[PDB]
Each structure stands twice: as structure tokens, then as C-alpha cells.
Design a protein around this ligand. Structure first.
Ligand SMILES: CC(C)(COP(=O)(O)OP(=O)(O)OC[C@H]1O[C@@H](n2cnc3c(N)ncnc32)[C@H](O)[C@@H]1OP(=O)(O)O)[C@@H](O)C(=O)NCCC(=O)NCCS
Ligand SMILES: CC(C)(COP(=O)(O)OP(=O)(O)OC[C@H]1O[C@@H](n2cnc3c(N)ncnc32)[C@H](O)[C@@H]1OP(=O)(O)O)[C@@H](O)C(=O)NCCC(=O)NCCS
Ligand SMILES: CC(C)(O)C(=O)OP(=O)(O)OC[C@H]1O[C@@H](n2cnc3c(N)ncnc32)[C@H](O)[C@@H]1O
Ligand SMILES: CC(C)(O)C(=O)OP(=O)(O)OC[C@H]1O[C@@H](n2cnc3c(N)ncnc32)[C@H](O)[C@@H]1O
Lengths: 460, 430
């Protein structure tokens, strides 16, 4: 047994399948979840050394990538060495590896005979998950679902498509390991939602899994079917796959529609167990980073080194308990804010208070400061007077200009209504960015509208 | 003492067992032992099952008391067919309304319920216990092994993953078999076009679904400018609908994919539903895997076994289930059973033409039982058939739009040619 007191802490992991926490325990693993972060970081470092050494020996993808970047496992002697020496893995590197070594790439590690399930992404990426990794996922997900207040015997509805995507399978595996009554109804086919609302009104689930948008659609289908969604008897709904569970307006509407608590969870399919970022019953706002399952680093995309707590960056993830297709510093490309304050549940994990929002796409620097176009887009979309289009113009790091469309009604209301909107837009942009921007208005329907992804940045 | 492997009630299969790589039978004793010796062990099992039901299911105690039966009276397979009354789907629906949500035939306590599944009037709820999930997974891996599917093979399960037991049963089997389970599923728009790229890339050894979906998938592959033969399939196994034992359908799918087609499937109430399934060598029709689920092909007028070579309705009994066990569940389906030598060497009764109808709206004219479903199947082979017909013997058949337009001679040709194929099927002047 490990000197850290950490429960079933070993690599490769082999969890006791019959263990269930005492019924009065808040934590599935009290020590792993509440030990001082400094001691957990020491244990994490030792695990990263084991995992990197493991990939060096079983994955030519990593040995090659690391050798090109001048890294070798003997060099990993601190978490500072991990961020500075180990290069990040991109999705394009995974697709390249799978194209050169089909079907699963040369980072699979396990022999082909160990592959239990085949899943994938929406050129697609193939997931070849080993038996041992499937057990490691089910155990981590049961542990995190316990944290949400979900218990043995509870009826758990998994209402997400059961296909290629890791989402629904991960929730179902967690529900099975927890000894919950699993109700794998799924989603995606016409006529399903109207059938589900009758099943939920009869069966009375204690918990529901899906996407926030599907839960909003199911609430509407219920009212069309002359059913009250508050009568399904749900204690909670837990969501992954898209934003919404940490967006105040969206979360509040779902909590009101169902009369239950909403929990945010979910990193990436590549990062299963994806509930490694998840809220708890008491830390119900945003998500906790369950660091001893998967090591999350919120980084500055300019150098891929950890940003200080209270700052914004990109989640970078490392598997600590996977032997098949392990991910070592996979860049998410998402945006988030992390803190390390006391958590209401008592868990000593970093928190993502606003969950995951935006992207690193088309990021630029205005004198040391990283500016994210998604953040400027989010700030303007808080305004009822915003017309739906804007452009980002940079001159001389140095000068930041924003060309913004007001809506048709603001433009019709006159000169004073346009100026009030332009001044408020300047105030809101400064708040979100934390840097001064010049704001100029442009006539409604002046800027090009694209059905594709908008590329709103001009020059540098 | 029978020699039957892991033969125990409640069953508890060794999860680590894999047969030697070159062994044809997953369980050689259970599969190739003399039928008379297996029947003896099945009788002993029906005794344990009926006693378990008596103690745990007021549904069975109530239903058996009405018909005047008690477990002490079960002394032969003849006592089982003559004394134990059959169960109908309507009886289950009443039991679930009286004792919600799973009925007073659930047997197991609530803590034992692993998965919640069901059927499409009033839906039946399935509460499958943990132990039964393992017994289903084990039975299906054994039967898939009999189809030539092996550890390591990529198995594409292309049926909806939801309420229905089909897809989950094929997945449970593929997982226990240590195959690479590929649960892509079905039912959502855009799925077929993305599946053909996955199958062209991954090259699956086995495919599971319905015969109609496999036909639809072949057409979608062609539209996508791919060849279904380029998937590298050894076999396709189907359940849920007829087709895998229908010559015209089976031949079409085998040709389109360049692989073998296997018929399987009884009822969702009867999971492990692969209790009726074909094998690699006995590839036509299905065998009845009697030591998993006891099948009786019965005369609907008295619910007793018809002799081998005759037609009747399947009646099913779980031998390895503790949750919602079915004892003489009436299928309402129509089949033919024989008990000749099987090419694979398994000593099981066989359904040579699989399941080919319903006992619904059957009428007896001159002592001969006529099945409207058989008339329909016969006419649905004739091209001149207008897609509709009537009985209420008087046969009022609709001719095709082309036949009607082709005149009197062509219409009399249809009218008489709609008597020869029917004649061979019925055996009575129509
Ligand atoms: C865009 C969308 C909401 C438009 O809905 P629509 O097709 O015009 O019409 P409907 O509202 O009647 O929904 C039709 C079917 O779409 C599916 N659907 C609708 N909203 C859904 C949602 N948010 N999530 C998942 N499936 C959804 C259901 O199968 C639904 O049928 P049902 O009501 O009988 O169960 C929807 O079709 C969709 O694709 N949603 C997902 C968008 C997305 O984020 N896609 C990225 C991949 S997850
Ligand atoms: C066959 C049926 C779907 C109608 O087909 P259709 O709509 O005229 O045919 P389309 O070519 O327009 O197909 C539309 C979608 O229906 C589904 N579908 C079509 N044929 C199907 C078949 N034979 N089996 C299953 N799904 C089928 C697919 O999702 C398809 O979309 P895709 O090709 O992008 O994957 C319908 O009559 C039927 O029988 N449905 C059965 C559904 C059911 O009970 N499923 C559960 C089985 S346990
Ligand atoms: C997480 C999972 C397995 O359910 C999933 O759907 O992952 P997938 O690989 O399909 O897509 C991952 C991306 O979806 C977005 N996403 C997933 N979950 C959330 C979430 N909870 N909040 C904000 N964004 C999310 C992020 O941009 C993330 O990088
Ligand atoms: C068998 C299963 C679990 O795949 C299924 O779908 O069962 P379900 O309860 O929905 O329907 C059972 C009925 O479908 C039909 N059926 C199923 N399999 C076959 C089959 N192989 N051949 C001819 N008919 C079949 C029979 O009429 C049977 O009574």
C-alpha cells in the first residue's frame, strides 16, 4: 500500500469491484478527495513518471514525439519539468498516427487482443479501449456520480445516443459500477422523446444524463404530451458534451423545468473517464478537477505552462489510470478559468467556477495580455442592443479597435440610443478582456454574414 | 453427474473460461450429449425452476392454483406440457398493472435489478437482475462461438441501443466472447452513411441487426460509392424479424455482402433470445439450445408437443434466470421442428425454416389448419400480386396494375398461378 494513504493507488489500476462506501460517507475515496493538495501533487508526479515511462516503452508515437522535442522520462523530476519539457498532443497528431498505423495509431500501447470496445469521434478518430481501461472508467464515473448524491438502487436514465460517442457509455458504465438501476433509453431517433416522457412519468428516475439542449427539448416534448416534467421525480440531471450546465440562464431554466439540481461534467471523449471535470452536490456551481484520476493543467497557449489560479487558460489533460491509448498533455483548445479556493463539499481539488467556455482559436496578444475572440463575442452577446456582427481590427500589440453592429431597433431609436449602446459595449468589452478597446459602430447589415465559422479578426 | 458444464441453478458462469482456439463447441458436453440424457437433466431443472417460481412469484402460484397445478405434480416432461398452463403477454401486462412496475413475477428483490428495458397498447417493463445479465452474456458468447465468431474479431452491433433487448444481447455476447465490441447502433438519420465509412475502414468480421436493415445498409453503401463486399465480413447474424431463413432474402444478403447469414431470436421476454439460433455448419434455419431455454413446439388447441416433422407454436421456459423468469410463455408464432442429425454435430431439435408465421386468425376447414400468415407469405413471392388480398373457402386476391391492364388472358393466368404456389403451402383446394 502507498505511503500517501491513497485508496487503491497503483499503476496499472485494479479496482475492487465489490467496494461500496458507507451510506453516510460524502466521499467515495475520502483520502484521495480531501488530502492536502501538496501531498496529492507529490503522488501525481510519481504517477506521471510511471505513465511517461510506460508510454516510452509501449508507444512509438510518444517516444518519437518526445525525442524530437528533446525529452526523455529520466528528465521528469517536477511538475515544472512536465509543463516545460513534455510537448502537448494535438488532435491532428492523433489522426496522423492512426493514418500511419491503422486503425488505432501507434499510441494504443496494449496488444490488439486487449481491445474491449470500439468507439470514435464525429477525418474521425478511432478509440480502441482495453478491458482494464473500461473498468477504470466505470469505477471513476461511479465515484464522481456518488459525489453528485447518486446512490445504489437509484433509477438512472441515460438519455443520450448509444453509438460511436463516449458520452452515454461512460454514464451507463458509472451507473452500473454504482449499483444504480440503469435505464439506457438513449436518444437520436424520431419518436423517442414522446416515448421517454411516458417512461419517465411511470418509472420516476432519481437521476438523468444527457446534454443541456436535449433536456430543454425533452421538457418541451413533455408539455406537448400533457405531462409535467417536475413530476418525473428527479433529484438531479448531469450533463456533458456541450456548454450550458455552468451558464446561469440555461442551468436555472432546466433546474426550474425539472425541479431538480443540475451538475456540469465533461472534458473530451479522448479523455474518458471524461467526468474528470465535474461538479459535486455541495460544489454544484461549475466543476472540480479530479486530479488523481486525470491531471488537468490550465495553460497559457503561447508557451503551454500553467497559468496562476484566478486566471484564464486552456485545459491540457494527462491520463493517470489508462493503459490503452493513454493521453499525455492533450491540448483541449477550450477556454476556462481555474481557482484553488476552499470548495463547499470539502474536496481539495482546483475548481472551474464558470465550467468550460470559448476556444483558443485566433488568440492574439495586446502587450503581454492574451485576447480571445470568443470572449469578445460572449461580451457583446450579453447585450440586447447588439446587432449580431462585429470585426476585430488591430494596429501598430498596441491598438485594439472593435467595429460593432447595433440592432435595427437601436439604430432606429436615434443618435443618443446609438451612443448609449456604443459606450456600454466599450464598458463590457473592457470588463471581459481586462484591456482597453476602442469601440466604433457600423450600420446594421454592413458586415458579411457567413453560415460557416466566423473569422472576425483583421491584422496585428 | 450428467457431465454438463457449469450446470447449476441459480447459474454462475466462470467469466475467465475460453474454449481451446480450435474447439467447435463452447460447451461440448451440453451441446453433443445424447438428447435423452439432456432431457433428464432439463426435467430436474424445470423442477427447481417451478419451485423457485412457487416461492418467489405469487403470479405463478396464483396462475398454477387456478389450473390445479403444484410443483410436486411435475414428474415427467409429459406432466409439464399437460399440467403447467401457458403464460400470455396479456397476463404479464395485467400482473404489472396489479403489481407495478415489474409485476409479481419479478422474483428478485429491487436491489438485484441491473438494467431497465422494455417493449414498444401498454408497454411491458423489463427489470433484469445482475446475475441474469451475466447468464445472457455467457449464453450469447457460447452461441456466437457456434457461428464461428472468435475472441479478437471486430463485431459491429448495428441495432438501436434503447428499450429493446436485441442490440444489448448481441453486445453482452460480443463482450463475454472477448471480441472487439463495436456498438454503432441504428435508428438516427445520417447513421447508415457514416456506418459504411466505419465498416470500410475497420473491416468487421461479424455484423448484428435485422435482415431489412442489412438490406438498407447495402443500398446506402452503393449510394456512397462503396461495395458492401469490401467490409470483409465472415458472417451476419440477425434477430427481430423473419428473413434469415427465407431463401430469397438470405440469398440476396449473402450475395450483397459475400458472407454467411445466421438466423437467431425468439422473444425479448425470452432473453437470452439466441436460445433459437443457427450454427456455422447447421447454417439453415435454427437449433433449439434446450439447456439454456426449453422450447416446446406445441399444438395451439391443447398446448402439448407436436411430433417431430409437424408445425406448431413455440412455447418457452427459462432454465437459467432468477429475474422475470418465463415458464411456458406462449410465443403465438408458427414453426416446424425436426430432430434429425445436425451437420455441426449438436444434438438439438431444429427449426429448418426458422419462424415463418403467426397462429393469429387461424381457421380449420376440413380438419386442416389454415394460417392466414402462410397465405400472405406465399402471395408475397408472386410478382403479379397487387399487394393485397382477402379470405372471409373464398380467396379474393388483388392483381397487379400491370396484370389488370394486360387483359383477360393475363388475369386468368394470375388467378390460376395464384392457386399452384398456394396449393403447395396449404394442401387444400383454393
Ligand atoms: C438542431 C436541432 C435542435 C433541430 O431540431 P429539428 O430536427 O428541426 O426538430 P425537432 O425539434 O422536432 O427534433 C427532431 C429530432 O431531433 C432530435 N433532437 C432534437 N433536439 C435534440 C437535441 N438538442 N439533442 C439531441 N437530439 C435532439 C430528436 O431525435 C428529435 O426527435 P424526437 O422529438 O421525436 O425525440 C436538432 O435536430 C439537432 O441536430 N440537435 C443537435 C445539435 C448539435 O449540437 N449537434 C452537434 C452534434 S451533438
Ligand atoms: C423501415 C422504416 C424505418 C421506414 O423506412 P423509410 O423511412 O421509408 O426509409 P429511409 O431510406 O427514408 O430511411 C430513413 C431512416 O430510417 C431508418 N431505417 C430505414 N430502414 C430501416 C430498417 N429496415 N431498419 C431500421 N432502421 C431503418 C434509418 O435510420 C434511416 O436513416 P439512415 O439511412 O440515414 O440511417 C419503418 O417502416 C420501420 O419499419 N421502422 C421500424 C422501427 C423499429 O421498430 N425499430 C426497432 C427495432 S427493435
Ligand atoms: C465530454 C464528452 C465525452 O461527453 C464529449 O462529448 O466529448 P467530445 O470529444 O465529443 O467533445 C469535446 C468538446 O466538447 C466541448 N464540451 C464537452 N463537454 C463540455 C462541457 N461540459 N462544457 C463545455 N464544453 C464542453 C468542449 O469544447 C470539448 O473540448
Ligand atoms: C428477438 C428479439 C429480442 O430480437 C426481439 O426483437 O423480440 P421482440 O419481443 O421485439 O419480438 C418477438 C417477435 O418477433 C418475431 N421474430 C423475432 N425474431 C425472429 C426471427 N428470427 N424470425 C422470425 N420472426 C422473428 C417473432 O414473431 C417474435 O415473436
Amino acid at each position: 500500500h502507498h505511503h500517501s494513504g491513497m485508496e487503491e493507488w497503483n499503476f496499472p489500476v485494479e479496482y475492487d469491484e465489490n467496494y461500496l462506501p458507507p451510506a453516510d460517507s460524502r466521499y467515495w475515496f475520502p483520502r484521495r478527495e480531501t488530502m492536502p493538495a501538496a501531498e496529492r501533487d507529490k503522488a501525481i508526479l510519481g504517477r506521471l513518471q510511471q505513465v511517461c515511462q510506460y508510454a516510452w516503452e509501449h508507444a512509438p508515437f510518444y517516444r518519437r514525439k518526445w525525442e524530437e522535442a528533446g525529452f526523455q522520462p529520466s528528465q521528469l523530476k517536477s511538475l515544472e519539468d512536465f509543463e516545460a519539457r513534455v510537448p502537448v498532443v494535438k488532435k491532428t497528431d492523433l489522426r496522423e498516427s492512426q493514418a500511419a498505423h491503422p486503425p488505432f495509431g501507434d499510441y494504443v500501447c496494449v496488444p490488439n487482443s486487449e481491445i474491449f470496445h470500439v468507439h470514435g469521434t464525429s477525418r474521425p478518430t478511432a478509440f480502441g479501449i482495453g478491458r482494464a481501461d473500461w473498468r477504470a472508467i466505470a469505477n471513476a464515473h461511479a465515484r464522481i456520480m456518488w459525489g453528485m448524491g447518486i446512490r445504489p438502487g437509484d433509477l438512472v436514465c441515460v438519455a443520450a445516443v448509444f453509438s460511436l460517442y463516449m458520452g452515454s457509455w461512460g454514464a451507463l458504465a458509472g451507473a452500473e459500477r454504482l449499483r444504480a438501476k440503469a435505464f439506457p433509453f438513449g436518444a437520436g431517433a424520431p419518436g423517442m422523446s414522446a416515448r421517454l416522457v411516458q417512461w419517465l412519468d411511470t418509472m420516476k428516475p432519481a437521476a438523468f444524463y444527457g446534454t443541456p439542449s436535449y433536456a430543454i427539448h425533452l421538457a418541451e416534448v413533455a408539455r406537448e404530451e400533457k405531462l409535467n416534467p417536475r413530476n418525473f421525480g428527479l433529484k438531479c440531471l448531469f450533463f456533458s458534451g456541450e456548454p450550458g450546465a455552468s451558464v446561469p440562464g440555461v442551468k436555472d431554466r432546466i433546474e426550474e423545468a425539472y425541479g431538480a439540481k443540475v451538475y456540469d461534467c465533461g472534458s473530451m471523449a479522448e479523455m474518458s473517464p471524461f467526468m474528470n471535470v465535474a461538479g459535486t452536490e455541495q460544489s454544484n456551481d461549475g466543476m472540480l478537477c479530479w486530479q488523481d484520476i486525470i491531471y488537468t493543467e490550465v495553460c497559457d497557449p503561447a508557451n503551454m505552462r500553467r497559468v496562476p489560479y484566478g486566471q484564464r487558460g486552456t485545459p491540457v489533460y494527462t491520463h493517470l489510470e489508462r493503459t490503452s491509448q493513454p493521453m499525455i498533455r492533450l491540448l483541449s483548445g477550450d477556454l476556462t478559468l481555474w481557482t484553488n479556493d476552499e470548495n463547499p463539499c470539502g474536496r481539495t481539488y482546483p475548481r472551474l467556477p464558470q465550467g468550460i467556455f470559448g476556444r483558443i482559436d485566433d488568440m492574439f496578444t495586446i502587450r503581454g495580455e492574451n485576447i480571445y475572440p470568443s470572449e469578445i463575442d460572449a461580451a457583446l452577446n450579453q447585450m440586447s442592443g447588439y446587432g449580431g456582427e462585429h470585426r476585430i481590427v488591430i494596429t501598430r500589440m498596441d491598438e485594439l479597435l472593435l467595429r460593432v453592429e447595433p440592432s435595427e431597433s437601436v439604430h432606429a431609436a436615434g443618435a443618443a440610443a446609438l451612443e448609449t449602446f456604443r459606450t456600454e459595449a466599450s464598458h463590457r468589452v473592457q470588463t471581459v478582456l481586462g484591456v482597453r478597446a476602442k469601440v466604433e459602430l457600423v450600420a446594421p447589415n454592413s458586415i458579411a454574414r457567413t453560415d460557416f465559422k466566423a473569422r472576425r479578426v483583421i491584422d496585428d
